Amino acid sequence: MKRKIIFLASPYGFSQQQKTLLLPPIVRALEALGIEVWEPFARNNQIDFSQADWAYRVAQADLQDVKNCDGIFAVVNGTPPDEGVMVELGMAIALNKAIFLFRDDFRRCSDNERYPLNLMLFAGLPEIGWENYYYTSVDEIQSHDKALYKWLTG
Amino acid sequence: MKRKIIFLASPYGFSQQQKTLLLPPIVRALEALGIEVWEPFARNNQIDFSQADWAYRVAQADLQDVKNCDGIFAVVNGTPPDEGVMVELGMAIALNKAIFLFRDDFRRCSDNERYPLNLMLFAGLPEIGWENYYYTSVDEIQSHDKALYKWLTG
Amino acid sequence: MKRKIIFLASPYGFSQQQKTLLLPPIVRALEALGIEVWEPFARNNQIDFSQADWAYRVAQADLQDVKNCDGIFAVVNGTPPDEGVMVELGMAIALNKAIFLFRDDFRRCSDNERYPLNLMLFAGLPEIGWENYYYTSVDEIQSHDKALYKWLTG
Amino acid sequence: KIIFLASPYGFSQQQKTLLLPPIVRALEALGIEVWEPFARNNQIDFSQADWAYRVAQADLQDVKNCDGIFAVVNGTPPDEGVMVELGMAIALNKAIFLFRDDFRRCSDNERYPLNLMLFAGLPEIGWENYYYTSVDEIQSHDKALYKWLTG
Ligand SMILES: O=c1[nH]cnc2c([C@@H]3N[C@H](CO)[C@@H](O)[C@H]3O)c[nH]c12
Ligand SMILES: O=c1[nH]cnc2c([C@@H]3N[C@H](CO)[C@@H](O)[C@H]3O)c[nH]c12
């Protein structure tokens, strides 16, 4: 028995209130599906401005977590999405990880008409049916008709 | 020198004035080193708001050029850096491509004291000496003492 | 039972989870100081992409509330802070309103070294002791040693 | 007669020397005395802690003493200092002119290409006459900046 591993990428650890109120409900949503959630702010233990001697080790721990996970769950909220989440999203695409995006932000920050965001954030997703991997609410995370559930059971 | 391939990832194509006045001087500086420059805005015909039936091909073209290149020259100006540049930069790190960063913007948009930006942008760079890969002037691109020159002669 | 009015500018209404979990604790902390809180998302019914005919109404509602308040409490989280918050902040500075800033985000997104953000966000604040108007935690709003309590006590 | 040119173009050394002068020339060609803050305040590098407040009050007084603002609202999202100086110009009833040649959309609505609060000082109808999408439109006679000088 080995549960699937999801790297939960988000900018929510940068804010004290967001870290304590927004991440735990998302973590619970994924693990009600049996997932082992790798949350980088708690794992790599970054709670304030990372010191000069600590910044490389945090980057390497996030680099290694992306290499050793099965899928990424990228909170792509904000205008624009957080640049650290994007670096790790591109690493997950190049390494053929399962890709899932989350944005409950109704603002559109896009360079095209087909996607709500920059089109490169969707390069790792199919041309038709990418919306199945695009979650717009925390309640939607556990939908048995969406891609994350079908990736665990399929 | 070897005629290496550089993928020039930048947001300068989104603005009419920047595509005309800012991108050509950077392309000329890279070509002055004997580099084959893959500039995606002209190489993939990203002229304006990408149509819906065209966005998936623009994404996959950027993705293929990152896979088939030798290195990436990421213009990481802005607060924060462009999310499309950040995705393409994440792909290059995971594919073990050469990494070179460009920022002549003097604003600091960082989460740490070591690096001037989010530390994940430097994950593919060495712990010591990453400054040699970090360019803060167009004129600094053709310096022998910087990593892009040494990369060509090795 | 005279009661000072504070306009609470934040980007938190753009995300479903942020509007539900982050704003109520902040409104609570202000109301516990006897403050009267005008919250634009609650007052304007802006719950998704505003219609074309509805967008100008929202614009004039955010505008009149700033003009008729006694002070603004600006949530200036994010890299960079929300541009609508920044417009409403400059209005309050221009109208000699009381200014209070909130940021529990530890990222530095600044053009200088004195302030943790762009220097113009502190133009309406004193050159010395501006930190007294700068809140970095929800638990800090109650502090009688900080400028919000003092502004309420004359 | 006086336009304050709010832009983030002074933050990049390449952008300050290549992008701002062409915009300054067009505004002056219409007959406007341009107030460019990065040059007017002769400061362009991570402002010394002892200088940052002075730079803030200098531009704060420039928006108070100008006749209108020309705000380069390019980028996703637009620069925060530009937006602060914009909201001041709106509260002080100054003339409002916006410039965005960036073809990316970053709005919270459908009518306006950006956050609807950048257009609070513009009319509900015909706000697009104040919205410039290219440098070769600054000198357009059918646009609000020329009509603003002709009474
Ligand atoms: O200071 C930090 N501490 C921990 N993780 C990160 C990261 C990585 N990038 C993402 C946020 O930028 C986050 O999900 C994490 O994997 C950037 N900066 C920090
Ligand atoms: O180095 C500077 N010199 C002059 N003004 C500014 C500012 C002020 N804030 C705004 C930031 O874009 C800018 O347009 C100007 O009004 C920031 N940095 C500088």
Residue numbers in the entry:
A (entry chain A), B (entry chain C), C (entry chain B): 1 to 154
D (entry chain D): 4 to 154
Structure paper excerpt:
To understand the interaction between CtNDT and ribonucleosides, we cocrystallized the variant CtNDTY7F, which possesses higher catalytic efficiency with ribonucleoside substrates than CtNDTWT with the nucleoside analogue Immucillin-H (ImmH). This analogue is a purine nucleoside phosphorylase inhibitor, rationally designed to mimic the transition state of the reaction catalyzed by that enzyme. Importantly, for CtNDT it is a nonhydrolyzable substrate analogue containing hydroxyl groups on positions 2′ and 3′. Figure a compares the structures of CtNDTWT and CtNDTY7F, depicting key residues participating in the reaction and substrate selection. A flexible loop that acts as a “lid” and could potentially allow bulkier substrates to be used was observed in an “open” or “closed” conformation. Figure S3e depicts differences in the normalized B-factors for this flexible loop and ligands, as only 2 molecules of ImmH were placed in the CtNDTY7F tetramer, with less defined electron density in the nucleobase moiety of ImmH, while two other monomers remained unoccupied. No major differences are present in the protein backbone, but the wild-type enzyme binds ImmH in a distorted conformation in relation to the ribose ring, bringing the 2′-OH farther from D62 and closer to Y7, likely to avoid clashes, which does not occur in the CtNDTY7F mutant. Following our interaction map with ImmH, a ribonucleoside analogue, we designed mutants targeting residues surrounding the 2′-OH group, aimed at further tailoring substrate selection toward modified sugars.
